[PDB]
Amino acid sequence: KTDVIVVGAGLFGSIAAKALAQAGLAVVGVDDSRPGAGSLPAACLMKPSWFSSMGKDKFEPSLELLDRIYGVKDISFKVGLLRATVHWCDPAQILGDEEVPVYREKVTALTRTSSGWAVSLEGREAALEARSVVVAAGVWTSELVRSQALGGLVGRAGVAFRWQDMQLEEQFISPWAPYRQTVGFNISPTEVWVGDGSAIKPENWNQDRQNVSYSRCAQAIDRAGFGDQEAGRVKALYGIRPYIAGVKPCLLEEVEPGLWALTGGAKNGTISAGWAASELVRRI
Numbered sequence: 001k002t003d004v005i006v007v008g009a010g011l012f013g014s015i016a017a018k019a020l021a022q023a024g025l026a027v028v029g030v031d032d033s034r035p036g037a038g039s040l041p042a043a044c045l046m047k048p049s050w051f052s053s054m055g056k057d058k059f060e061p062s063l064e065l066l067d068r069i070y071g072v073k074d075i076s077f078k079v080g081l082l083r084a085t086v087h088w089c090d091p092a093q094i095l096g097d098e099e100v101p102v103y104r105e106k107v108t109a110l111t112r113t114s115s116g117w118a119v120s121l122e123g124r125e126a127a128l129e130a131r132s133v134v135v136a137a138g139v140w141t142s143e144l145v146r147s148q149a150l151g152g153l154v155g156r157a158g159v160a161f162r163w164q165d166m167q168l169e170e171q172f173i174s175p176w177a178p179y180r181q182t183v184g185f186n187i188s189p190t191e192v193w194v195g196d197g198s199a200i201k202p203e204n205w206n207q208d209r210q211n212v213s214y215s216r217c218a219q220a221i222d223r224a225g226f227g228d229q230e231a232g233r234v235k236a237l238y239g240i241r242p243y244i245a246g247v248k249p250c251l252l253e254e255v256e257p258g259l260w261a262l263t264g265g266a267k268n269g270t271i272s273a274g275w276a277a278s279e280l281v282r283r284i
């Protein structure tokens, strides 16, 4: 009766699971909410010039899927003296959607059965059953499935900041280095999100490194000097992105019959989740 089990309910598991559910499948999710997941700090802003490598071949079917399922909003961002249109999917809408039921437990094993796949859970005598399994477990995907591509999965950490009870009159993109932009916008009607775009080897991460990105972000919105961290006015959101070098969109591979690995979204984020989901609707 269960068609697909999706392991992981970050952006990639959430989007894939709901696209399959919308396509008529019986989908079940499993997620253990482990700390440092990649999707908590995400803004889900998609500027078309950021995704040139992808190609209209993939950008457009992906954006259409996200618009059909969640709705895509067009935001006119300030870019110096000029303006630029950026597409937005509300991350709270993607990550909080409840169509797909999610077991808030830890997957410990995957086993082929005669009818499909059995998904073991920590501390559970029975396994969850499905014809197919999509493992969208972020940087932890290689803990459950292995492949030459997954042998290259590493984490690229980063931080973004959310200021409470605040709105920007001007949502902006401002560069601080080639291909490094400080982005500030109204992520909710009450909150301002700012990120500087840096990615870090999770080893080279510490409070000093975080304060460097905080200084960038707070100067871009004129909050430097106000001690907003110590005062509780801003939340730091740390996450580890799943990076695999050389990935086309992201990694979507059928490692065994019915067993898919969906990860490697550090490079392109939400738009490549949309591409992968459209692929899975076609192929499952």
Ligand SMILES: Cc1cc2nc3c(=O)[nH]c(=O)nc-3n(C[C@H](O)[C@H](O)[C@H](O)COP(=O)(O)OP(=O)(O)OC[C@H]3O[C@@H](n4cnc5c(N)ncnc54)[C@H](O)[C@@H]3O)c2cc1C
Binding pocket: 007, 008, 009, 010, 011, 012, 013, 030, 031, 032, 033, 034, 036, 037, 038, 039, 040, 041, 042, 043, 044, 045, 105, 106, 107, 108, 136, 137, 138, 139, 140, 141, 144, 157, 158, 159, 160, 195, 237, 238, 239, 240, 241, 242, 262, 263, 264, 265, 266, 267, 268, 269, 270, 271
């Ligand atoms: C600072 C920062 C800024 C970002 N900004 C953006 C942005 O503007 N736009 C954008 O699109 N993206 C953004 N991202 C996100 C980026 O695209 C990530 O690559 C993306 O979130 C990856 O999502 P994922 O679903 O593959 O992984 P994750 O979000 O890490 O999800 C993996 C999930 O799998 C679960 N899991 C793992 N193993 C198991 C197990 N054994 N059993 C059960 N559950 C398990 C984990 O608990 C977790 O919830 C940002 C990330 C960071 C850190």
